[PDB]
Ligand SMILES: CC(C)CCC[C@@H](C)[C@H]1CC[C@H]2[C@@H]3CC=C4C[C@@H](O)CC[C@]4(C)[C@H]3CC[C@]12C
């Protein structure tokens with residue numbers, strides 16, 4: 001109906017970016033935050049609150 | 052460390068409260084009421100927002116019965132929340148055999164789904180069959196063959212009620228570890244709580260027999 | 267060569283009993299689903315059998331191998347007292363298990379409302395009180411021979427309090443349980459399938475009660491009928507040493523067999539073993 | 544109409560991508576495999592655990608159990624801090640306030656109960672009751688001490704004002720029951736998954752479905768927001784997890800394996816977002832890689848299905864709560 005078609009009318013009028021650009025942004029965030037990620041590398045027990 | 056001592060005392064008292072609440076809730080017979088709509092849930096509750104709890108004691112035995120009729124959504128996303136209830140009290144109105152498919156067939160489908168359910172493999176069902184007098188009036192006014200086309204009995208209480216009971220028992224598939232306690236209830240039958248007490252005691256006895264290796 | 271075979275054959279039995287009891291206790295301790303009243307009784311029985319097979323079994327094997335008890339006399343009295351404490355404690359653990367099963371099978375209302383771990387604690391305390399009060403009278407009142415007292419009075423008192431009164435208690439409790447369970451199975455009963463299931467359940471309860479009573483009887487009855495008759499007819503009938511030792515170790519094997527009956531046949535314990543290994 | 548209008552969106556789904564994320568992401572070295580160990584274990588609940596939520600302090604955490612209890616821990620010292628009794632014991636969700644002064648819960652009672660925690664007298668009282676839903680309250684998430692966003696089994700999400708007590712906004716459009724709910728880091732939008740295999744991104748300010756993604760093939764159970772804020776991850780009963788991008792409007796990566804056949808109950812992201820952790824019906828929590836779609840270890844199983852998990856905002860710990868009434872901390 002009118003409500004159902006309005007639910008997706010604005011979906012067409014959206015800006016889609018390149019998937020390569022999105023992957024580059026994700027890679028940049030991961031690499032700029034990889035250093036401060038205790039789950040990636042084993043955190044030393046000195047600063048680890050779970051000794 | 053005064054803060055640590057206070058935290059330890061708080062943990063100890065919280066553990067005490069949790070343990071005592073668990074002990075209180077262990078000695079309660081958990082019952083799950085059902086029914087495909089106007090099958091007699093209100094009558095069963097009166098003679099004894101989203102979920103209604105009826106907590107009643109009979110012969111020093113506590114029953115807590117949960118009705119989820121007002122909960123209209125996908126059942127499988129919350130049905131497991133009732134895994135471990137002592138018994139299921141499924142209610143079916145005998146007068147709904149002719150009403151419209153049929154409310155009787157809808158009740159049968161719901162009964163099958165929650166009986167052969169994988170969260171309710173080893174739990175017993177206390178089936179009620181309400182409105183026997185109205186069922187008699189309706190079978191005098193019209194045959195039962197509308198609900199069950201493959202029927203050849205007479206339009207009397209005995210044959211029709213027995214066939215309905217047999218059809219509802221046949222839906223059970225876990226015959227090894229569950230049994231159905233069919234009863235016939237009217238608006239004046241005062242033995243319903245007695246029957247549910249008998250069924251609960253029987254299932255507890257059978258569970259103890261299985262635990263000791265004698266069943 | 268004959269003294270090493272009889273030592274290894276007894277050491278193997280002692281090791282099997284110790285490992286079995288230790289495994290049962292470990293399964294109960296390392297599981298949260300196995301901490302109920304029934305499993306508490308079974309695990310107390312397993313602990314008692316562990317005490318038997320760890321304390322009184324190595325010294326019994328040493329006495330069997332070295333025909334002479336060179337380990338003093340007060341030590342012999344102490345070991346006899348500990349033995350007649352632990353064995354009667356095992357028997358009364360069996361009786362307590364039977365009585366708790368009887369209460370659970372007869373009274374659902376009690377089973378739901380009043381059942382608590384304090385009931386199991388009281389049962390175990392009564393069992394061990396009986397054990398101590400049976401073991402202590404010998405302490406109150408051939409050097410190379412360690413045997414129980416043969417006074418007629420204490421002999422009949424201990425044999426009845428540790429095997430005959432417990433035997434009658436278990437017999438009547440399990441008989442009433444048998445009739446109650448038969449009534450339940452008949453009450454539960456297409457129709458042919460229902461009656462076949464009822465007959466299968468009846469055979470199952472008959473077999474379980476037979477296993478329990480056979481483990482009790484075939485183990486301790488040959489020991490206790492001898493302990494009752496021999497002190498009255500010392501010289502009328504000869505008691506061979508080999509046959510007496512076989513009877514004594516037949517009684518001793520009850521501690522080994524108790525886990526195999528009460529825990530190693532139990533589905534919860536089997537599941538705990540499978541999950542822990 | 545709507546079905547015809549969906550055609551151009553479907554065409555753009557493949558026109559804007561014309562590739563796969565694996566080709567772009569296959570040029571980086573995988574991070575070293577991590578063997579997380581159960582640092583702490585929280586006990587005290589007596590029934591199945593249905594939800595948990597880390598506090599913003601990275602130390603406290605709430606947990607909801609079917610026994611009728613909502614417990615609040617202190618994972619660094621394992622000691623209890625609170626145990627709120629419930630009006631209804633059929634609780635299936637809980638939430639922690641970002642301020643930490645409030646805790647939400649809800650379940651089959653079709654009402655989101657808000658419990659205050661800055662009480663001088665030391666106990667807990669219900670600050671507000673929100674019973675405008677006609678279905679079980681599957682999920683809830685605080686935006687502040689004033690506004691919350693719930694999602695119920697009546698195929699409806701709702702932005703509630705706690706002080707007003709009424710639905711300030713109602714998010715409709717989900718065909719099935721909404722089971723999952725995640726908030727964007729800026730809280731200007733949120734994403735909610737439901738049982739119709741669709742995750743919808745809604746703007747809180749306008750209350751309109753800004754985006755819709757139909758990647759999953761079964762009932763979505765869990766959802767989380769990537770730390771970047773331009774992507775999110777979704778886990779369903781199809782034994783698979785997916786990552787979708789807000790700007791790209793396309794599913795990027797799919798996480799699945801032959802050793803996983805059961806449904807996913809909870810998902811979350813790490814501090815950098817590199818690792819994706821998801822708890823399954825097979826007792827296990829698997830740690831994935833958001834840039835390579837390869838596993839980085841399986842946490843030691845609970846005794847029952849793991850119903851919830853949570854990665855701390857600083858990435859310092861991962862809690863998993865299961866249907867066996869235990870909460871395991873991994874680090
Ligand atoms: C499997 C269960 C029933 C426990 C083990 C029971 C059997 C195998 C045990 C119990 C007591 C044992 C006996 C105890 C003592 C002796 C005396 C000596 O000559 C060594 C063999 C012999 C004769 C043993 C043979 C094996 C035996 C009969």
Ligand SMILES: Cc1ccc(CNCC2(F)CCN(C(=O)c3ccc(F)c(Cl)c3)CC2)nc1
Nearest residue numbers: 322325326329345349350353412424425428514
């Ligand atoms: C009331 C009662 C009496 C006796 C018993 C069981 N009594 C078994 C034995 F009669 C078997 C033979 N015995 C030994 O072989 C033995 C010898 C030296 C020892 F140091 C030990 Cl420890 C055992 C002595 C005990 N239950 C209850």
